[PDB]
Design a protein around this ligand. Structure first.
Ligand SMILES: COc1cc2ncnc3c2c(c1OC)C=C(C)N3c1ccc(Cl)cc1
Ligand SMILES: [Zn+2]
Length: 349
């Protein structure tokens, strides 16, 4: 309760410092954006979101920065890597003007592996040219860097499609009773992205932009969190959920049980709790303890039932036995139940 606000304030202590690191990050990205716009196929490249910390909100350790590069690919033809609902092959509709991505084609399909390797090469060729800071490219996110040994920058390359969302998403983003039918309509008119996540020809759908948008305009009231009277704890509940998983993942690092779990799981579950608790009166700042519990309780029910539907792709189950093993889900359940029933000691000093 007061224990939870102490943790959120402690999570602020680190966030206050970031100001020096954010500037060093932007200097590298912009120099890499200019070197890419030189290339024939990467002329339409650019960063997704413009804001502070450069989309750092993933890890509560303020050193890991995640940046997304986008590239508009018009007249796109998506062919589902059938029955998966989320992974697609990239085909091209009409051939009057030859597309700059011809070099990455593997027949009709656009190879993500060929598209990545050239991208990965261009910047590695540019790192040795950098005389300002010390950049170390680690390959295992499409590309990763270690700026000044302290800063870690994970670069992701995404295709942008300004067309209608795939039929698999038709029944997703069920925000109607929370954010409204008007908002759903407006969000679905926005573009969608595809990330190289493999069959080294397949790309997975990305809605990181929609997610960010609904988190920064998350109430039923348009003035939610805009004044002292309408302050909810939606954002704090997500921050605590993300922090719980980070603390447990770090606790059991050399045990590989939680390797399949990520903050995406905790963000998905959170949006499902927002859909079931659509009223701003269900997220009052004074009720933080119970709201966080509602999030913990719902996550525990997802683990036990082995059902965590993708919030955009409802037939895609993130907790299927094909994605995460029963033992792994049962192991996370045991750890979270211990936390819940012991007043989250993993949050203590
Ligand atoms: C929009 O749809 C998705 C977005 C994602 N954004 C991040 N990570 C995602 C997704 C997934 C998606 O659904 C198809 C699915 C999975 C398994 N993961 C994921 C989760 C945990 C770990 Cl360890 C690695 C990857
Ligand atoms: Zn709010």
């Amino acid at each position: 309760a007061s224990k939870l606000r102490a943790v959120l304030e402690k999570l602020k202590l680190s966030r206050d410092d970031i100001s020096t690191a954010a500037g060093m990050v932007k200097g590298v990205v912009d120099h890499l954006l200019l070197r890419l716009k030189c290339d024939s196929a990467f002329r339409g490249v650019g960063l997704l979101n413009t804001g502070s910390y450069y989309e750092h909100v993933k890890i509560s350790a303020p050193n890991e920065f995640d940046v997304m590069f986008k590239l508009e690919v018009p007249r796109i033809q998506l062919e589902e890597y059938s029955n998966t609902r989320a992974y697609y092959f990239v085909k091209f509709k009409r051939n009057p003007k030859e597309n700059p991505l011809s070099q990455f084609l593997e027949g009709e399909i656009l190879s993500a592996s060929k598209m990545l390797s050239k991208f990965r090469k261009i910047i590695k060729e540019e790192i040795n040219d950098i005389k300002d800071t010390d950049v170390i490219m680690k390959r295992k996110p499409a590309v990763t860097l270690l700026i000044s040994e302290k800063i870690s920058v994970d670069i992701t390359l995404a295709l942008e499609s300004k067309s209608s969302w795939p039929a698999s998403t038709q029944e997703g983003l069920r925000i109607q009773n929370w954010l409204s039918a008007k908002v759903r309509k407006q969000l679905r008119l926005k573009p969608f992205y595809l990330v190289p996540k493999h069959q080294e020809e397949t790309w997975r759908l990305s809605f990181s932009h929609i997610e960010k948008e609904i988190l920064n305009n998350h109430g039923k009231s348009k003035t939610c969190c805009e004044n002292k009277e309408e302050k909810c704890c939606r954002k704090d509940c997500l921050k605590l959920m993300k922090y719980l998983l980070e603390q447990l993942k770090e606790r059991f690092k050399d045990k590989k049980h939680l390797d399949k779990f990520s903050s995406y799981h905790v963000k998905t579950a959170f949006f499902h709790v927002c859909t079931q608790n659509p009223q701003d009166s269900q997220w009052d700042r004074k009720d933080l303890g119970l709201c966080f519990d509602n999030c913990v309780t719902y996550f525990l029910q997802c683990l036990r039932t082995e059902k965590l539907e993708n919030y955009f792709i409802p037939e895609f189950n993130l907790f299927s036995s094909n994605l995460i093993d029963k033992r792994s889900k049962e192991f996370l359940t045991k750890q979270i139940e211990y936390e819940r029933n012991n007043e989250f000691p993993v949050f203590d000093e």
